[PDB]
Amino acid sequence: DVFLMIRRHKTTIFTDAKESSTVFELKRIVEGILKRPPDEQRLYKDDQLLDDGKTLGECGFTSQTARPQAPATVGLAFRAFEALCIEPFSSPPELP
Amino acid sequence: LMIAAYKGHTDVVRYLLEQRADPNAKAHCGATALHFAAEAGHIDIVKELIKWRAAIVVNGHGMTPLKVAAESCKADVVELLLSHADCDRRSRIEALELLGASFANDRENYDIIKTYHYLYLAMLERFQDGDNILEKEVLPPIHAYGNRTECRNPQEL
Amino acid sequence: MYVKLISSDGHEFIVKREHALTSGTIKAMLSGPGQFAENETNEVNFREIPSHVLSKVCMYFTYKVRYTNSSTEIPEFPIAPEIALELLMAANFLDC
Amino acid sequence: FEQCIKLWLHALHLRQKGNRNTHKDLLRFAQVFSQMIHLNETVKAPDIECVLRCSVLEIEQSMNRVKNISDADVHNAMDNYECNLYTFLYLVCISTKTQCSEEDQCKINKQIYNLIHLDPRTREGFTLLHLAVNSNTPVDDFHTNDVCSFPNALVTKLLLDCGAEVNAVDNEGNSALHIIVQYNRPISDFLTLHSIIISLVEAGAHTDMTNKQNKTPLDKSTTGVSEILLKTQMKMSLKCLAARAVRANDINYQDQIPRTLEEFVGFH
Known part of the structure; x- marks a missing residue:
């Protein structure tokens, strides 16, 4: 039970994956919603490339690091792979 | 002190403890008059003994006065003894x-x-x-x- | 199945249907002439609330769906001091 | 006891028709009901509902009297009006302690509804709910001390059924939930601390409201049982967390939020 956030430049996905699972499950559940093939999508997480289906833990996100309070921002890239151009959220106004 | 606490009379217990009696002394099995005060449901006697530091010690059956009070469905005495x-x-x-x-x-x-x-x-x-x-x-x-x-x-x- | 939660900045915040339905006016927006009964987009328009308050609201959706019965283990939801008074009005409007 | 009840009721009616103070009469009459309860005897419903109507009328008259009167008479009227409130509480405890028919229960609920919508307040600001859950609510040394015990899980459920303002506040801002959490007999009385907390919470008590010193109900809890039991029933909401973060960070919430939300940040 670890909660992940898959962020493109504009869109954003909030998903959940089991601890005893691999990257294949999340690849399938992000292919199902975004209708894009798994080979085109790349989990460009923290300016680092990842693998396809080896291990959840070595990717970089764990149960403690990724929480529903603030999940880790996992980027997404598609083949043209594209560069990381994740548009940040709007800056809140400065409180007095 | 043990028989005074076992009975429903607390004035005798208060008079005994007011002259530095033995509320930590053991009875036959393990009783320190707390195991007898927490047997019939005498909340005032338990309060008086706790105030004068009667201490919590297991009896011959390994039953603390809190556990003795819990065994006999004494909710009041359990409430008092859970705050120690x-x-x-x-x-x-x-x-x-x-x-x-x-x-x-x-x-x-x-x-x-x-x-x-x-x-x-x-x-x-x-x-x-x-x-x-x-x-x-x-x-x-x-x-x-x-x-x-x-x-x-x-x-x- | 999945609700695309647009923002005032154009950000898409696709979350689960059960996660978004914890809000009140999200369910009110989805019901009525806004079903789009093909479970492909389920878009709802937010032309008044910025992207960061959507980030907080969706994170709260995941937070509430995950944490519904866990005694006092309930972790503290982190609110930035600048993003409060904007998450407050957003949670009022969404009946969250 | 039937003849005594009838004679007392006739005397109370005669005194009420003459526009005279009946707080002592109502108090003695409730003492009579408590004494009759302590003897385990069947209780009539019509006299209960009639004395409930008389008590709500007397409390309204007491409020009318204290609204404008001299200062010594202000103290006398406040004392008599608080005594009338306590006697109404004892009468509600008696009513919920005995068995009544459907129409009689409906009439009793109507009388309690009328008094609740009258909104009575003591010196400290305790409504009918803040007194039915207060262990410091005084009980008369007579037979009322035998059956009228506060907090009571049956008076509170009756007041919630008749629609008492659950989130009402005292002069210190304590809700009806800031008072039951600090109950001093949680383990001994885990039936009026549970059936009240689980009643106030499901009746719409904000389990995060801050009193005048900014203390939530689980922050105003003097025992660990209430903290455990309140945190079970409490439900999370982003309007509560965001308002709590606004109050904690000392953000200016004046005219930057809806008018109905300036009250929400007022107590959350």
Whole structure:
């Protein structure tokens, strides 16, 4: 039970994956919603490339690091792979 | 002091303790007049003995006065003895569980709503932090009590 | 099945249907002439609330769906001091 | 006891028709009901509902009297009006302690509804709910001390059924939930601390409201049982967390939020 956030430049996905699972499950559940093939999508997480289906833990996100309070921002890239151009959220106004 | 605490008279107990009596001395098995005050449900005697530092010590059966009070369905005495500044979580929840269990099978004090509520209160006290969670030492099932292997979760409770 | 939660900045915040339905006016927006009964977009328009308050609201959706019965283990939801008084009005408007 | 009840009721009616103070009469009459309860005898419903109507009328008259009167008479009227409120509480405890028919229960609920919508307040600001859950609510040394015990899980459920303002506040801002959490007998009385907390919470008590010193109900809890039991029933909401973060960070919430939300940040 670890909660992940898959962020493109504009869109954003909030998903959940089991601890005893691999990257294949999340690849399938992000292919199902975004209708894009798994080979085109790349989990460009923290300016680092990842693998396809080896291990959840070595990717970089764990149960403690990724929480529903603030999940880790996992980027997404598609083949043209594209560069990381994740548009940040709007800056809140400065409180007095 | 032991027989005075066992009876319903507290003036004699107060007079005895007012001249530095022995509220820590042991009786035949283990009683220190706390195990006798917490047997018939005399809350004032327990309060007086606790005030003059009667101390908490197991009896010959390994029963603290809190556990003796819980065994006899004395909710008042359990409430008083659960506030002692040294009670420990394991003893607090086992006293609450024993009180809830004792309310289930008794004649003078038979309440099944109190049984469920005290068992649930001790269950929620076990499962509140997640970290350093207190887990129940479930005994193997006994054929006499049907085949129920205790209730170590709030869902089954 | 999945609700695309647009923002005032154009950000898409696709979350689960059960996660978004914890809000009140999200369910009110989805019901009525806004079903789009093909479970492909389920878009709802937010032309008044910025992207960061959507980030907080969706994170709260995951937080509430995950944490519904866990005694006092309930972790503290982190609110930035600048993003409060904007998450407050957003949670009022969403009946969250 | 039937003849005594009838004679007392006739005397109370005669005194009420003459526009005279009846707080002592109502108090003695409730003492008579409590004494009759302590003897385990069947209780009539019509006299209960009639004295409930008389008590709500007397409390309204007491409010009318204290609205404008001299200072010594202000103290006398406040004392008599608080005594009338306590006697109404004892009468509600008596009513919920005995068995009544459907129409009689409906009439009793109507009388309690009328008094609740009258909104009575003591010196400290305790409504009918803040007194039915207060262990410091005084009980008369007579037979009322035998059956009228507060907090009571049956008076509170009756007041919630008749629609008492659950989130009402005292002069210190304490809700009806800031008072039951600090109960001093949680383990001994885990039936009026549970059936009240689980009643106020499901009746719409904000289990995060801050009193005048900014203390939530689980922050105003003097025992660990209430904290355990309140945190079970409490439900999370982003409007509560965001308002709590606004109040904690000392953000200016004046005219930057809806008018109905300036009250929400007022107590959350």
